[PDB]
């Protein structure tokens, strides 16, 4: 089959970090990609699953605004919600029908008592994340509990991604049990050490690049939430990117790519931005931007630029400068090569990437834990 546009038109998308409604031109192709653009798209990339309407339920409501239709999608272990608004009810119905057609057209023992519930890691609209301990193994896991109302496919394993081990559902809930690293939060390590050495950051940076490459080329998904808070270390001291994300309703926007703040089309380059912010904090001991006013913090990320400390090396300068480019098309890793643009960078000279993936590179830091069951970083 050939990928063509099923329906295109102007919609009013609710901003994901801005309560306001925003005029965006959306394209609905038969591959399932529902992407919206600030202006009518240039007639001139690879398919990302972030925008796929596959396995999504459409809900038409009149709140908080009349003629509203909501797409609700289960992506990996996180329910995402995208709210849209049209002017006439007839437009909504031909939009939902079009999307429902493509969505359907793309079809082509374990219980709660087995775990011990120590800490609430996060709460959200469609569920919560809880730090649990399996009674039998004595091991620590993160359980992602989602509302049910809202096949072992574990070839999704990767050394630097929190593994989704299994999935079970209770009466009215769907629970995702996943690995929880006990090497402590990385921000807790960074703040404790104030700043990472340039080579140490290289290590953490390399392992993230490996994982991002994996998500982009194999899984064709964008992580989109690459921040310091979402990075942990395992007992060995290697990076684990978490998957504890939840939708919430009603500083925080610092880790956000400019195109994401402007609710434009975003792609893989967003993760490289995220990567830039993280590696900036590791080598500088400070976020790129800080100011309190959300309108000023937004404009900081949108138009103001990033100063570099003279303590920083020139190779790190070129890397952060490229990673933290305002325009995703000019951004390092933003072209077709993706992660290859970043892996070939001089900051990562002498770093062989097959070895990073096989954890051959010796960690520059070893967490103070005898075992995975060591609760030294939880207390
Ligand atoms: C409140 C409204 C709303 O929609 N809120 C909201 C905003 C943002 C998000 N997310 C969703 C999760 N995303 C992080 C993320 C991205 C990708 C994965 C992931 N995906 C796949 C897909 C297919 N196969 C895989 O093996 C995958 C693995 C992973 C993955 C990535 C890293 C670690 C573990 C697993 C997971 C999380 C952030 C923004 C949601 C709701």
> Tokens 């049910």 identify what position?
148
Task: Return the DSSP state at 235.
Answer: T
Classify 1-108 by CATH class: mainly beta
Q: Do 276 and 320 touch, CB atoms closer than 8 A?
A: yes
Q: Is 173 helix (H, G, I), strand (E, B) or coil?
A: strand
Bridge partners, residue 96, by sequence: none
Report the DSSP beta bridge partners of residue 116: 133
Helix then strand then coil, in percent of the chain rounded to 5, is 30, 25, 45
Q: Ligand 1 pocket test: pick from 154, 215, 222, 244 the residue with the most ligand atoms within 8 Å of its Cβ.
A: 215
List all residues 6 or more positions away from 321 whose beta carbon is below 8 Å from its beta carbon: 306, 308
CATH code linked to domain 109-184: 3.30.200.20
Q: In terms of DSSP bridges, do strands 239-241 and 231-233 run parallel, antiparallel, or are they unpaired?
A: antiparallel
- What distance in Å separates the CA atoms of residue 32 and residue 378, rounded to the nearest whole number? 42
What are the residue ranges spanned by the domains of the chain? 1-108, 109-184, 185-379
Strand 164-169 versus strand 140-147 pairing type = unpaired
Burial class (CB in 10 A: 0-12, 13-18, 19+), 259: buried
Using the CB atoms, write b or e for 325-349: b if 16+ within 10 Å: beebeebbbbeeebbebbbebebbe
CATH dotted code for 185-379: 1.10.510.10
* Cβ of residue 225 lying under 6 Å from some atom of ligand 1: yes
* Ligand 1 midpoint to CA 160 (Å): 15
In sequence order, the β-bridge partners of residue 167 are: 176
- Listed in sequence order, the residues at least 6 apart from 223 whose beta carbon sits closer than 8 Å to its beta carbon are 212, 215, 241, 270, 271, 274
Are the beta carbons of 34 and 28 closer than 8 angstroms? Answer: yes
CA angle 325, 326, 332 (to 5 degrees): 30
**Phi and psi (nearest 5°) for 240?**
-130, 115
**What is the best residue among 48, 76, 217, 226 to mutate for testing ligand 1's pocket, by most ligand atoms within 8 Å of CB?**
76
List Cβ neighbours of 114 (8 Å cut-off, separation of 6 or more): 134, 135, 136
Rounded alpha-carbon distances, angstroms, from residue 82 to 15, 36, 109: 9, 11, 35
Q: Which residues pair with 81 in a beta bridge?
A: 72
- Which has the closest alpha carbon to 16: 304, 360, 280, 266? 266
Distance 10 CA to ligand 1 centre (A): 27
Tokens read off for 93: 């119905």
Contact 301, 261 (CB under 8 A): yes
Q: Is the CB of 208 inside a 6 Å radius of any atom of ligand 1?
A: no
Strand partners, 13: 22, 84
Identify whether 2 is a catalytic site residue.
no
Q: What are phi and psi of 334, to 5 degrees?
A: -90, -15
C-alpha–C-alpha distance, residues 67 and 85, integer Å: 6
Instruction: Tell me how far apart the alpha carbons of residues 281 and 90 are, in angstroms, rounded to a whole number.
Output: 49
Indicate the helix (H) or strand (E) that contains 315. Answer: helix 314-323
Which residues make Cβ contacts (< 8 Å) with residue 3, sequence separation at least 6? 29, 30, 31
Same fold, 109-184 and 185-379: no
Name the H helices within 86-215: 89-105, 186-193, 198-213
Largest CA distance in the chain: 63
In our burial notation (b when 16+ CB lie closer than 10 A, e otherwise), range 144-175 reads: bbbeeeeeeeeeeebbbbbbbeebeeeeeebb
Residues making up the annotated binding site for ATP are: 121-129, 144
Whole-angstrom Cα distance, residue 13 to residue 22? 5
Name the resolution in angstroms: 2.7
Residue 27 backbone phi and psi in degrees, to 5: -120, 130
């Amino acid at each position: 089959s050939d990928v063509a546009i099923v329906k295109e038109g102007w919609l009013h998308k609710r901003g994901e970090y801005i309560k306001t409604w925003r005029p965006r031109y959306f394209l609905l192709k038969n591959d399932g990609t529902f992407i919206g653009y600030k202006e009518r798209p240039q007639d001139v990339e690879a398919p990302l699953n972030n925008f796929s309407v596959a396995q999504c339920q459409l809900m038409k409501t009149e709140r908080p605004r009349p003629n509203t239709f909501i797409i609700r999608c289960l992506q990996w272990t996180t329910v995402i919600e995208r709210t849209f608004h049209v002017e006439t009810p007839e437009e909504r119905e031909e939009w939902t029908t079009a999307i429902q057609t493509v969505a359907d057209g793309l079809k082509k023992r374990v219980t709660m008592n087995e775990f011990e519930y120590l800490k609430l890691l996060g709460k959200g609209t469609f569920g919560k994340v809880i730090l649990v301990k399996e009674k039998a193994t004595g091991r620590y896991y993160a359980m992602k509990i989602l509302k049910k109302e809202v096949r072992v496919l574990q070839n999704s394993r990767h050394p630097f991604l929190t593994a989704l081990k299994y999935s079970f559902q209770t009466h009215d809930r769907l629970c995702f049990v996943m690995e929880y690293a006990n090497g402590g939060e990385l921000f807790f390590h960074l703040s404790r050490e104030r700043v990472f050495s340039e080579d140490r950051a290289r290590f953490y940076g390399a392992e993230i690049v490996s994982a991002l490459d994996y998500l982009h080329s194999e899984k064709n998904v964008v992580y989109r939430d690459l921040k310091l808070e979402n990075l942990m270390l395992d007992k060995d001291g290697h990076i684990k990117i978490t998957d504890f994300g939840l939708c919430k309703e009603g500083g925080t926007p610092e880790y956000l790519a400019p195109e994401v703040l402007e609710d434009n089309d975003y792609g893989r380059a967003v993760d490289w931005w995220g990567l830039g912010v993280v590696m900036y904090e590791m080598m500088c001991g400070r976020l790129p931007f800080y100011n309190q006013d959300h309108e000023k913090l937004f404009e900081l990320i949108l138009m103001e630029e990033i100063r570099f400390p003279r303590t920083l090396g020139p190779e790190a300068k070129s890397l952060l400068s490229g990673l933290l480019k305002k325009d995703p098309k000019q951004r390092l890793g933003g072209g077709s090569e993706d992660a290859k643009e970043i892996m070939q960078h001089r900051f990562f000279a002498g770093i062989v990437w097959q070895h990073v993936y096989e954890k051959k590179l010796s960690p520059p830091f070893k967490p103070q834990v005898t075992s995975e069951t060591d609760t030294r970083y939880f207390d």
